[PDB]
Amino acid sequence: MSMSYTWTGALITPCAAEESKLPINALSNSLLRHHNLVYSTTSRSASLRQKKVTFDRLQVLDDHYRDVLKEMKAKASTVKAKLLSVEEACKLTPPHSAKSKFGYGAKDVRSLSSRAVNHIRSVWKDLLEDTDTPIQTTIMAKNEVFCVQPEKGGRKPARLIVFPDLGVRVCEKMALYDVVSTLPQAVMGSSYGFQYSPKQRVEFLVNTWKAKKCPMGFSYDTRCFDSTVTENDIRVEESIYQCCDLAPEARQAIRSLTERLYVGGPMTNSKGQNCGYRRCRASGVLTTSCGNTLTCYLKAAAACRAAKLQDCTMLVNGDDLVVICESAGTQEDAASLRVFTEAMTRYSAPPGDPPQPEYDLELITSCSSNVSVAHDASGKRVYYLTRDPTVPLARAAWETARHTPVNSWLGNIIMYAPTLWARMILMTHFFSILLAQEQLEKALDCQIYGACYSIEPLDLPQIIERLHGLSAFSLHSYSPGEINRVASCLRKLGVPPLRVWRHRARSVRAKLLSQGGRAAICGKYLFNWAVRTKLKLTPIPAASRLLLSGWFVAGYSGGDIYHS
Ligand SMILES: O=C(O)/C(=C/c1ccc(Oc2ccccc2Br)cc1)NC(=O)c1ccccc1
Ligand SMILES: [Cl-]
Numbered sequence: 004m005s006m007s008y009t010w011t012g013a014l015i016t017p018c019a020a021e022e023s024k025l026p027i028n029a030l031s032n033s034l035l036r037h038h039n040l041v042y043s044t045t046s047r048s049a050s051l052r053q054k055k056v057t058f059d060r061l062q063v064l065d066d067h068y069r070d071v072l073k074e075m076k077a078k079a080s081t082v083k084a085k086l087l088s089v090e091e092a093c094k095l096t097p098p099h100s101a102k103s104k105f106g107y108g109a110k111d112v113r114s115l116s117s118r119a120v121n122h123i124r125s126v127w128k129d130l131l132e133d134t135d136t137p138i139q140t141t142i143m144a145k146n147e148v149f150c151v152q153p154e155k156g157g158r159k160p161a162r163l164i165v166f167p168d169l170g171v172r173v174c175e176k177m178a179l180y181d182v183v184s185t186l187p188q189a190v191m192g193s194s195y196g197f198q199y200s201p202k203q204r205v206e207f208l209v210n211t212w213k214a215k216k217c218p219m220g221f222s223y224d225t226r227c228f229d230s231t232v233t234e235n236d237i238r239v240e241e242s243i244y245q246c247c248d249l250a251p252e253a254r255q256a257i258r259s260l261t262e263r264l265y266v267g268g269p270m271t272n273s274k275g276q277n278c279g280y281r282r283c284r285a286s287g288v289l290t291t292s293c294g295n296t297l298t299c300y301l302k303a304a305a306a307c308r309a310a311k312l313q314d315c316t317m318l319v320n321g322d323d324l325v326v327i328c329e330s331a332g333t334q335e336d337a338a339s340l341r342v343f344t345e346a347m348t349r350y351s352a353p354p355g356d357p358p359q360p361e362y363d364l365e366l367i368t369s370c371s372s373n374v375s376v377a378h379d380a381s382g383k384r385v386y387y388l389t390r391d392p393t394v395p396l397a398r399a400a401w402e403t404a405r406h407t408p409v410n411s412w413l414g415n416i417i418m419y420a421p422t423l424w425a426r427m428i429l430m431t432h433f434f435s436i437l438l439a440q441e442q443l444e445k446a447l448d449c450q451i452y453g454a455c456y457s458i459e460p461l462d463l464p465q466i467i468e469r470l471h472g473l474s475a476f477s478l479h480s481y482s483p484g485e486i487n488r489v490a491s492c493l494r495k496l497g498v499p500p501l502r503v504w505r506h507r508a509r510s511v512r513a514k515l516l517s518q519g520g521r522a523a524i525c526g527k528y529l530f531n532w533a534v535r536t537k538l539k540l541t542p543i544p545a546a547s548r549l550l551l552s553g554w555f556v557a558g559y560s561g562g563d564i565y566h567s
Contacts (some may be wrong), residue, residue, distance in 0.1 A: 005233065006058070006059055006060075006282065007282060008279050008281055009279050010053065010057070010279040011276075011279055012052070013143055013278050014046075014270050014272065016046060016273045016274050016276075017045065017273060021043070021047075021146060022043055022045075022235065023042060023047075023144075023198065023406065024039075024041075025038040025039075025041045025042075025167060025400070026404045027359070028403060028404030029239065031495070033432070034428075035496045036497025037315050037496050038497075040496060041150060041151075041400060041401060041496075042149060042150075043146050044145065044148075044149070044158075044159065048144070048158070048161050049144035049160070050465050050502050051160050052161055054165075054187065054308070055103050057230070060230075060233050060283075061463075062233050062349070062350060063349050064350070065305070065361055066363070067308040067346070068350065069300070070304070070308075071301055071304045071308075072301060072304070075191075075243060075300075076246045078190045078191075078242075079243050079246035079247055080246045082179040082182075082186055082189045082336075083246045083247065083249075083474050084182045084247050084248070085181050086246055086252060087176055087180050088177075089120055090115060090244075092121070092176035092177045092180065093112050093113060093119075093123075093173060094113065094565075094567075095176050095565055096112050096113055096172070096173065096176075096563065096565060097563060100563055104168050104171035104334055105122050107122065107169075107406065109169075109474075112169060118504055122170050123173050123473030125181070126173075129180075130255070130259040130263070131252065131255050133259070133263075134263065137194065137263055137267070137273065138167055138171060138263045138264045139168070140264075140269070141166060141167075141168075141273065142163060142165045142270040142271070143273060144163060145162040145164050146161065146396045147161075148394075149394055149397065150393045150394060163286060164286050165286050165287050165288075166286075166287030166563075171290070174260070178253050179257060180289065182244055182247060182293070183290060183293035183353075183562070184255075184557045186297075187293055187557055187558075190243070190297065191296075191319065193298075193359070194304075194316070194317045194319055195319060196318050196319055196333050196558075197292075197452055197556065197557045198555065198556060199555060200555040201247060201387075201418060201419075201421075201471055202470055202472045203384050204318075204370075205374060205388050205390065205547055206363065208374055209228060209386050214449075215246070215327065215328065215329050215330075217330045217331060218330065219327070219330035219361070220326060220327035220361055220364065221354035221361060222323075222324065222325045223303065223324040223326065223347065223358050224355055225299075225352050225353070225355070225357070226294060226354055227355075228352070229283055229284035229286050229291075229295070230284070231351050232295070232298060233283070233351050234266045237261065237266045237563065238266065239301075240297055241258065242267070245258075257307075262500060263300060264288060265281040265285065265290060265294070266282070267280065268280070268281055268285075271280075286561050287561045287562075287563070288561065288562070288566040289562040289563070290555070290562075291321075291560060291562060292452075292453060292559055292562060295559070296321050299319050299352075300319045300344075301321050301349065303324055305348035306350065307326065307343065310340070310345040311339060314326045314328055315328035321560060322370070325370075337360060351506060365469060372389060372390040373390065375388075376481070376485075377479060377480060377482070380474070382475075382480070385421075385474050387422065387475070388418075388421075388422075389422040389423075389485060391488060391492060392488075392489060393492050393495070393496070395415045396424070396428070396492065396496060398411045398415075399411070399428075399433075400434070400496075402416055408448065409450060410434075410448075413448035413460070415429060416430055417470065418451070420467040420475050421475040421478055423481050423485065423489055424492075427504045427505065427532075427533075428477075428498065428504055430508075431511060431533075432504075432527075433460075433512055434525070434529070435507060435511050438511065438514055438515070441523075443521075444521075445460075446458055446459040447460075450560060452554075452555065452557065454466075454559045454564040454565065455463055455565040455566065456566050457567065461522065461525065464524050464525050464543055465546040465548075465549060466549075468542075473541075475533055475541065505533050508530050509530075509533050512526040512527075512566055514515075527540070528540055540562050
């Protein structure tokens with residue numbers, strides 16, 4: 004019976020200026036024309052989110068819980084993690100990461116400046132000596148762009164982000180980076196989502212579904228998961244980590260960060276005021292993704308048992324959960340789901356929207372996406388992942404009319420390269436603007452599984468072939484429902500129909516070829532679809548020449564991570 008937060012009454016304030024509406028760009032209109040449906044969240048709506056994330060939590064454990072837990076620990080005891088040298092940790096820090104409140108920022112930290120490495124060592128030392136004093140944190144209102152839509156009733160309030168000082172963040176890396184990059188797959192195997200790349204996730208979902216006599220799957224939407232995490236859940240996560248083979252120093256740092264940071268602590272707004280007290284999951288620490296994934300999996304696996312699901316397979320990504328199993332008849336399936344929901348609720352994890360059995364894999368949404376079909380060169384049936392393009396396009400627009408240090412369009416192109424909208428619009432629109440400014444060589448940052456990466460457009464052809472397979476460049480004969488969903492979206496926002504883009508694609512793939520080099524390798528592989536005349540595409544040379552491990556190994560959302 005512990006509230007997830009307590010509030011002092013002080014407002015959540017912003018630091019920088021917050022743009023609510025879309026500007027007045029002319030390229031932005033080349034993408035979207037209904038600019039009034041696009042919008043960003045601001046600290047103005049922060050109090051509404053506060054209401055939502057604030058509630059009492061009731062939790063009642065049971066034998067199924069302890070059993071699964073015990074099983075997890077067993078698997079964890081087979082994991083050995085190392086500490087990260089201050090230097091190593093410092094490098095995993097993002098150039099733009101929020102500056103330390105102790106005078107010094109990201110570059111200072113990244114360049115191993117004296118001052119920074121000093122404070123960091125002090126903070127570390129302090130963790131080893133003090134194990135109880137709650138570490139201070141800052142709470143801001145996130146600013147993300149969405150599309151207005153009355154079906155839901157208007158606008159979504161801003162999300163909240165709770166994080167500790169830069170000094171602390173580096174310590175987290177040192178004491179837990181190896182754990183959160185290895186412990187997950189160790190305990191849950193195939194159920195751990197972040198070990199898969201697009202091509203792998205698709206293959207995993209499809210195969211699991213087809214392995215069932217009569218498949219039945221459901222996604223579980225938890226009402227504000229982070230707020231449902233209890234102090235006991237976080238302490239349990241800690242015990243799991245401790246099952247690892249660690250250094251005595253790492254153990255003490257983990258216990259201290261757990262008791263002083265993870266379980267809870269005071270929060271101040273940007274103006275340094277006492278905002279409230281947190282007794283749930285911090286949204287902006289290193290263990291957020293790892294912790295939610297472990298806790299979601301724990302409750303869900305125990306819930307499955309109370310529900311008696313048959314031959315069930317789980318796929319967990321943070322709080323995002325999808326379960327596939329053998330059906331026991333439609334009525335039994337519904338009842339089993341209501342029990343699963345009852346056990347989750349008991350484990351302190353009720354749902355927002357109630358789960359519903361689904362018997363069509365393509366009608367299931369997990370990780371904001373669904374499986375769909377298309378065909379390859381030899382007309383072979385190819386499965387891929389997609390989603391409604393609305394948000395991606397509203398954001399793709401916004402980033403065209405306003406500068407964003409971290410875009411999303413490029414990320415979406417990487418995550419959804421095989422989709423119709425990605426290939427024909429995003430790809431087209433962006434190589435267009437690039438060319439009109441000569442920046443095809445300039446790298447830009449985008450996030451993948453929460454981690455930051457500096458990527459160069461010129462490499463998409465390889466990146467893409469790696470993540471989705473060569474077929475991704477020749478997919479055709481997309482399912483009508485998918486083709487319909489898109490065109491429906493375009494007409495809703497003001498985006499020229501696929502035809503207007505099929506035009507530009509040639510008009511663009513042209514200027515790209517009459518440039519050879521790398522810009523050529525692209526315009527050929529990425530736009531082979533926009534030409535009746537189709538030249539044969541084969542394994543790209545430097546498709547292998549490039550390290551891509553770090554990419555799909557674990558989740559780091561909210562973890563302030565950067566990879567090179
Ligand atoms: O922030 C996160 O933690 C994050 C998690 C996440 C979990 C699972 C997932 O599965 C899919 C779903 C569809 C296609 C391929 C894959 Br692998 C994708 C993302 N989002 C991005 O990485 C992300 C990056 C760019 C664009 C959008 C999201
Ligand atoms: Cl269809």
